[PDB]
């Protein structure tokens with residue numbers, strides 16, 4: 001709505017690709033977020049003017065509560081810094097949640113293990129796994145109605161090699177000649193509405209597979225991929241946003257490693 005203020009930055013070169021080594025836009029015109037493709041100053045202005053609030057959801061059950069401290073501490077240094085953030089930690093051990101110091105405008109809720117609550121408190125929802133840590137900037141450049149993240153182990157793979165559910169009996173089934181990318185189940189999100197639609201669809205699909213006595217090869221991730229195949233994401237995040245340096249190193253194609261597995 002509101003107009004952006006005067007800003008000074010490099011023009012942008014119509015005749016110069018921002019990247020010559022990677023695909024920066026999908027066939028359905030959704031941007032693929034790589035370092036160098038965005039001016040964070042412009043994006044920060046756009047989202048702050050909207051007083052955007054981002055919700056970050058994580059599940060920490062059983063032995064996984066041990067990952068919370070590093071997860072939250074690093075998020076405080078790299079996730080949506082400058083914007084309103086609301087952390088939602090779902091755990092079976094509320095008292096085991098570390099007391100992490102948060103910056104201003106950021107809050108955390110412990111939910112022991114509602115839907116409409118999200119719609120009321122945040123504009124976007126970012127759903128990630130807790131056994132990770134932020135190592136670099138993860139900001140508003142990822143926000144959009146719906147986004148998936150390229151899985152680090154298959155970004156350069158052909159569709160036939162993707163570990164999609166290949167059994168026709170499963171609702172998550174995807175044949176060999178179908179598929180755009182293999183998205184990681186550990187990092188996805190979008191507007192509250194779109195995220196609830198995705199989780200709702202996947203919940204029902206999994207219920208169907210259950211009754212039929214079948215369980216997708218990679219569970220939630222398998223259904224996520226089926227959903228995103230049929231409902232194209234409005235933005236796709238590159239592997240910079242979901243990596244594992246111990247297992248994959250640090251390729252030249254990745255100018256930054258932002259969110260990674262904890263060794």
Ligand SMILES: CCCCCCO[C@@H]1O[C@H](CO)[C@H](O)[C@H](O)[C@H]1O[C@@H]1O[C@@H](C)[C@@H](O)[C@@H](O)[C@@H]1O
Pocket residue numbers: 152153154163185218221243244247261
């Ligand atoms: C062909 C080489 C690929 C190496 C990565 C395999 O990653 C696993 O992929 C499956 C789907 O095929 C699941 O997504 C699984 O969760 C992935 O493992 C997890 O992510 C990788 C990157 C690594 O951090 C593992 O320790 C995780 O368990």
Ligand SMILES: O=c1ccn([C@@H]2O[C@H](COP(=O)(O)OP(=O)(O)O)[C@@H](O)[C@H]2O)c(=O)[nH]1
Pocket residue numbers: 059060061064129130131132186261
């Ligand atoms: O067999 C499993 C593996 C993971 N999880 C849950 O998934 C979350 C994060 O998943 P994972 O360990 O697969 O994360 P990744 O290494 O993919 O980041 C954990 O907090 C657990 O609550 C689970 O319930 N069962």
Ligand SMILES: [Hg+2]
Pocket residue numbers: 057125126127195
């Ligand atoms: Hg979520």
Ligand SMILES: [Hg+2]
Pocket residue numbers: 198201202203205223224226227
């Ligand atoms: Hg689904």
Ligand SMILES: [Hg+2]
Pocket residue numbers: 199202203206220223
């Ligand atoms: Hg599900």
Ligand SMILES: [Hg+2]
Pocket residue numbers: 198199202220221223224227
């Ligand atoms: Hg899903």
